[PDB]
Amino acid sequence: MTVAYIAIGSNLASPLEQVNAALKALGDIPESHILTVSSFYRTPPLGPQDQPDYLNAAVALETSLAPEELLNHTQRIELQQGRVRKAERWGPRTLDLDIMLFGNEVINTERLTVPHYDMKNRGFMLWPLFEIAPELVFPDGEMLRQILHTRAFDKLNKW
Ligand SMILES: Nc1ncnc2c1ncn2[C@@H]1O[C@H](COP(=O)(O)CP(=O)(O)OP(=O)(O)O)[C@@H](O)[C@H]1O
Ligand SMILES: Nc1nc2[nH]c(SCc3ccccc3F)nc2c(=O)[nH]1
Ligand SMILES: [Ca+2]
Ligand SMILES: [Ca+2]
Ligand SMILES: [Ca+2]
Ligand SMILES: [Ca+2]
Ligand SMILES: [Cl-]
Ligand SMILES: [Cl-]
Ligand code: NA
């Protein structure tokens, strides 16, 4: 088994409802168990700002799935919760499940890049991750605690 860390975002169609439904669906992924769920955070949108605030969270998921098999399930859950692709880049969504980390693995396949390419710059990913995994070390040896100590990220507020 490995521990994967999944970021959750939602800013459409009742985010609290979407995220609670997603937690139930994440539990039902085969070969996998949720170990830890963060608090829920209400975060202002980054990138396009003409959209509702997000509910952001993180989950630790122990799994024996292959990384792309986990992606299959997270994409299925998003689609089953009504995620619709629109042409605008980084538009609002009912549910977004990003695989932040998959153990200490560095994955670069056609469908999957892990670590998530921008997570070290996003407080809405890092703060919920630190809540559930304060001792985390990245594949490149960087410590989560050191990033959060050193870099300016705006304060997050709970939902
Ligand atoms: N670590 C990862 N987690 C989830 N999907 C990933 C991924 N690495 C690559 N992908 C790919 O990312 C594709 C596009 O996903 P989107 O959800 O539209 C990007 P987004 O989450 O809106 O922006 P972001 O990646 O800047 O956070 C997916 O279809 C999937 O194949
Ligand atoms: N708060 C919040 N803002 C978001 N913007 C996006 S689109 C990626 C993106 C694009 C540009 C800058 C930062 C980014 F993150 N996703 C979320 C989310 O989950 N939470
Ligand atoms: Ca399971
Ligand atoms: Ca827009
Ligand atoms: Ca995302
Ligand atoms: Ca995504
Ligand atoms: Cl959507
Ligand atoms: Cl890394
Ligand atoms: Na580095």
What number does the ligand 1 atom closest to the CA of 9 have? 21
Q: How far is CA 149 from the centre of its chain?
A: 21
Only one residue has tokens 């989950």, namely: 59
Alpha-carbon distance of 23 to 29, in angstroms, equals 10
Q: Point out the catalytic residue in the list 89, 98, 122, 145.
A: 98
CA distances from 48 to 43, 52, 64, 89, 103 (A): 13, 10, 36, 8, 31
Between CA 18 and CA 14 the distance in angstroms is 6
Distance 98 CA to ligand 5 centre (A): 6
77 lines ligand 1 (CB under 6 A): no
Phi, psi (deg, nearest 5) at residue 18: -65, -45
Q: Are 115 and 145 in contact (CB under 8 A)?
A: no
> Is the shortest distance between the CB of 88 and ligand 1 below 6 Å?
no
Asked if residue 45 lies in contact with residue 53, where contact means CB atoms within 8 angstroms, the answer is: yes
Nearest CA to ligand 2 atom 1: 45
Residue 149: phi and psi, rounded to 5, are -75, -35
Does residue 121 have its Cβ closer than 6 Å to ligand 1?
no
The angstrom resolution of this structure is 1.1
Instruction: Verify whether ligand 1 is closer than 6 Å to residue 112 (CB atom).
Output: yes
Domain boundaries, the chain: 1-159
> Experimental method for this entry?
X-ray
Query: Is 76 among the catalytic positions?
Result: no
d(CA 69, CA 61): 13
d(CA 20, CA 155): 24
Q: Say how many Å lie between the CA of residue 70 and the centre of ligand 2.
A: 22
- Active-site residue, selected from the candidate residues 76, 83, 122, 151: 83
Domain 1-159 grouped into CATH 3.30.365.10: no
Tokens of residue 58, six digits: 């993180």
CA distances from 89 to 92, 120, 154 (A): 9, 21, 24
Phi and psi dihedrals of 108, rounded to 5? Answer: -145, 90
**Helices then strands (H, E): number in the chain?**
4, 8
Give DSSP secondary structure letters for 27-96: HTSTTEEEEEEPPPEEEPPSSS-SSPPEEEEEEEEEE-S-HHHHHHHHHHHHHHTT----SSTT---S-E
Cβ-contact 119, 28 below 8 angstroms: no
The pair of three-digit structure tokens given for residue 90, joined into one six-digit string: 């980084």
Q: How many angstroms does the Cα of residue 141 sit away from the middle of ligand 9?
A: 7
CA-CA distances (angstroms) from residue 60 to 66, 90, 104, 155?
Answer: 16, 25, 13, 22
**Phi, psi (rounded to 5 degrees) for 99:** -80, 105
